[PDB]
Design a binder for this molecule. Structure first.
Ligand SMILES: CN1c2c(nc(N)[nH]c2=O)NC[C@@H]1CNc1ccc(C(=O)N[C@@H](CCC(=O)O)C(=O)O)cc1
Ligand SMILES: CN1c2c(nc(N)[nH]c2=O)NC[C@@H]1CNc1ccc(C(=O)N[C@@H](CCC(=O)O)C(=O)O)cc1
Lengths: 271, 271
């Protein structure tokens, strides 16, 4: 049921160095390491366990862009990177220059993607996010999402990837246009936690639940709490949002995964 | 699983007219209807579906106190009362003067209490809260709480009480002294929702999760969201806390129990 079997700390993956944001896009254009390194530091300070790294749209060679991002981040910060790209060569390139164990974001449930990405994760000893979806699209029901989760689990195992290295992403969509999905995603999280011992982990790009909605911060933090209750292990999230991190810390306590103390908000942040 | 079978609006029971609070205690002493009527109005305005009514400690006759509270409330407000007392004569007295259908708070799983209170609820057509506990104390595990829930369900049914009239209370305790209970309560909520068709409802005195803890509002609203995810139907709560009601409204939307709109915070409040 909802009593968590594990005590593992919740994994916060800072979402902010992503070329979708103008300041990151322009730093990449100008090859200016300053905005990159500032955001790496700010997120580290706020307590991120990993830093997401996404080139964004570029006409530049994604391989060079990724190597660059990864090295300039890890120069000023000791944190592993969550390498976020649809380009396997870009991912492998970041992995070759990465210090420590990385996370790969992501592979789909498409067979040819699994076939490429899983070997990469084993070879480099990286964690890997599988998304529940394939070229037929992202499913609606929890039952259809769970079916793709099982397929991801099977392939991961067959490539010799430990379940503690595998993070399944149910794909949260915005509540305004997508509303009915948010509860199906919650149930999928619950089901994934059942699929093996030890169980696969679970992750969400969290901010997607609110994209283009009126009070983003309130919706984001409400849903993170719901997802954590359902069994969520990790989120790509804005770690710069103090209210959001406050909510996660409070939920982690109420879940009995860390011993309560009056200082728990501060303690949660230092891990 | 976590996809709710029903669309019912979340039931907010205003906690504030309770003799534990000095201003209420003194209004009762002086027989001053003003503070009572102000709090009835404020809570109604904030969107409460019921108003909790608790005499608090008194050397006065609880029967007279209760009749008085109930009449002075319902004079200025059209809302039903949730009659909160350990004294069955006080409860029956409020029920005789009550306009509309009341709620009784509460009976324990003690046989002699069930034997007294259930007939009262059927006779007066009142909803009734059962608490999961008896003279052996409040159980620790969800499994032990659920066992008392089943016993409450059985007695309610045997008295001809519909499950839609029955609200089972798992008994939340403060996270500072009680921390391990909060997750057991969540699992109990989940289990209760399984025990019949239609299912019994569930309720928490919510503010108990934070009593004598440092940031009460944050802990209260985090846990309400978790409990709603688990299937919570109703809470005795501070409806005057706008952040708390904002959180519940957001969770209700994310649960798909009401159709999303940009105005949903306001819409949730008008029911
Ligand atoms: C698809 N999301 C996602 C993922 N990875 C996984 N595994 N799952 C996911 O759902 N990586 C990318 C993204 C998560 N990251 C983000 C990052 C930013 C914003 C965001 O809110 N963008 C701002 C940009 C502001 C600007 O352009 O200046 C926005 O308001 O749109 C959302 C999600
Ligand atoms: C035991 N709680 C409870 C219930 N009913 C049910 N079914 N379940 C419950 O757990 N009724 C009473 C109470 C819920 N109501 C309340 C009301 C106020 C406070 C509270 O926080 N009290 C303030 C009082 C401040 C003052 O005295 O001025 C406090 O800070 O202690 C807690 C719970």
């Amino acid at each position: 049921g909802l009593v968590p079997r594990g005590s593992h700390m919740f994994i916060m993956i800072g979402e902010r160095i992503n070329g979708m944001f103008k300041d990151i896009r322009e730093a990449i254009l100008n090859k200016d390491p300053r905005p990159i390194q500032e955001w790496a530091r700010r997120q580290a300070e706020k307590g991120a366990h990993y830093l997401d790294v996404n080139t964004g749209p570029t006409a530049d060679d994604p391989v060079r862009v990724m190597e660059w991002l990864v090295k300039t981040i890890q120069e000023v910060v000791d944190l592993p990177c969550c390498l976020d790209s649809t380009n396997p060569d870009a991912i492998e390139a970041g992995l070759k220059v990465h210090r420590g164990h990385a996370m790969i974001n992501s592979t789909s449930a498409d067979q040819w993607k699994m076939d490429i990405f899983f070997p990469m994760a084993k070879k480099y000893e990286a964690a890997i996010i599988g998304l529940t979806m394939n070229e037929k699209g992202v499913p609606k029901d929890a039952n259809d999402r769970s079916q793709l989760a099982m397929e991801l689990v099977a392939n991961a195992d067959a490539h010799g990837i430990p379940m503690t290295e595998l993070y399944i992403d149910p794909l949260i969509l915005p509540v305004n246009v997508a509303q009915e999905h948010a509860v199906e995603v919650l149930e999928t999280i619950r089901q994934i936690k059942l699929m093996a011992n030890p169980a696969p982990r679970t992750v969400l790009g969290l901010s997607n639940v609110s994209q283009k909605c009126p009070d983003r911060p309130l919706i984001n933090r409400t849903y993170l709490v719901m997802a954590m209750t359902a069994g969520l292990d990790a989120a790509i999230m804005d770690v710069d949002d103090d209210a959001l991190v406050d909510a996660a810390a409070t939920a982690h306590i109420l879940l009995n995964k860390e011993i309560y103390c009056d200082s728990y908000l501060k303690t949660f942040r230092q891990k």
